[PDB]
Ligand SMILES: CC[C@@H](C)n1ncn(-c2ccc(N3CCN(c4ccc(OC[C@H]5CO[C@](Cn6cncn6)(c6ccc(Cl)cc6Cl)O5)cc4)CC3)cc2)c1=O
């Protein structure tokens with residue numbers, strides 16, 4: 234025995250004396266073997282959900298997950314059922330599929346899980362400090378309350394003609410259209426929709442000054458900030474590269490522009506009820522009496538515009554793409570436009586938008602087939618027991634929920650891979666509570682989150698943008714339909730999603746051919 238402890242020591246010294254080749258080689262081959270041994274041992278644990286096997290340590294199942302998450306989830310679901318874990322770039326993600334998963338994660342106790350712990354790197358570098366996920370949850374709840382106060386039915390009545398003006402100006406002035414000069418053309422929807430989206434959301438939420446800025450070199454800062462919104466931040470939120478410097482600069486420059494306007498409006502008492510800026514200036518004092526700073530207000534503006542930017546632009550791109558191979562649906566939507574707007578003799582209003590059920594069902598169905606966020610998650614802060622199981626999810630794990638996956642299951646949506654707006658007949662609401670409501674600080678919302686359709690999530694982190702998105706998308710699509718027909722280049726069809734970006738946008742280039750329904754129609758203005 235004593236002779237063996239000596240040879241331990243001897244073995245240590247010989248190990249350290251190995252050639253620099255073998256030692257390097259051992260450096261990688263040792264934790265490769267340990268990783269594999271640990272997993273086999275982990276599988277013996279009956280209080281842990283099954284863990285997807287993987288070869289490369291740290292990296293885990295990152296490649297297959299990020300490239301086709303729904304295919305990954307379905308294969309895992311077959312082998313293990315609805316609850317399973319996988320390693321993702323240093324983290325352990327526990328996935329809970331289906332409505333019970335929704336309930337488990339979206340309705341989890343505030344003390345059990347943290348969204349800001351999961352997300353703050355995806356957002357704080359882009360938006361700025363003090364808001365969204367760079368603040369306690371109770372602060373987020375009131376920020377959501379503040380933003381929601383600019384998102385009223387009255388606001389939407391005022392936004393609808395502004396959004397319409399931007400769409401028509403885009404049709405008139407953009408090189409992608411020029412409808413006064415050209416009667417047919419080809420566009421990349423991943424070019425047009427981001428532009429139309431920022432033009433319409435700027436004009437309505439930020440106001441005319443901020444909209445005007447986008448006609449200048451200033452627009453390039455939005456591009457820079459936009460490029461700083463990437464899943465890469467999930468791993469590398471700060472790296473000494475030019476990319477990261479333009480982002481940080483952009484955030485500074487853009488928040489500075491918003492603060493400049495804010496300070497001017499106050500130093501002119503020019504504070505009204507026009508836009509989200511006026512609203513936050515009048516209404517951004519927390520319940521404990523602390524006021525948001527001008528910097529925090531500006532940062533909150535950036536976050537709200539950036540969030541609405543990517544979800545919405547992706548969604549209208551998908552709407553155009555699905556309709557491009559469905560002239561029957563374009564036709565049905567057009568007849569509804571003619572009926573509700575009296576053959577075009579009525580001006581579009583917010584109230585008339587609500588009387589367009591097929592148009593709204595089209596948005597609704599697009600959001601079913603294309604949830605812009607395939608995976609939502611939280612960091613586990615306290616050990617969680619999974620009801621009706623012996624599973625315990627340890628703190629330090631992350632939980633992942635994917636309502637978009639359930640959107641595409643035949644059990645909940647018959648022929649789920651078929652685009653059919655009529656599956657929503659007499660059910661054209663963006664969403665609704667089928668029962669009890671609860672209020673987390675930004676208004677009463679559904680207490681239950683068991684709906685198999687959950688494009689806007691649920692619980693305390695639920696979206697507050699849904700009515701703005703439908704308003705924006707509704708106006709945009711109403712004008713598209715009334716103005717244009719469109720179709721695919723020969724042999725093209727709906728592209729597959731790119732699941733590696735922040736949202737699940739179409740893989741580009743995604744081109745459609747438009748043509749004017751009324752070639753002689755002119756769009757006025759200078
Ligand atoms: C290429 C680098 C490589 C190493 N890498 N490393 C990691 N990844 C990766 C990770 C994850 C993903 N996925 C999953 C996570 N992800 C994602 C998840 C949640 C999310 O947002 C949830 C919260 C925070 O952002 C918003 C988005 N939003 C909601 N409504 C409107 N926007 C949000 C909420 C509120 C506000 Cl004010 C702003 C924002 Cl942006 O909600 C955004 C992206 C989508 C891509 C893909 C690739 C990589 O590609």
Ligand code: HEM
Nearest residue numbers: 540541544545609688689690693694695696697698701702
């Ligand atoms: C089709 C359009 C949209 C979809 C499908 C969508 C989806 C979602 C989802 C799923 C969440 C929950 C995230 C989570 O639980 O992890 C969310 C949160 C949120 N979204 Fe949206 N969104 C859309 C548009 C918008 C718009 C237009 C705005 C702003 C005007 C917006 C602002 C917000 C805010 C403030 C939150 C709260 C985040 C939190 O509390 O953690 N969203 N959205």
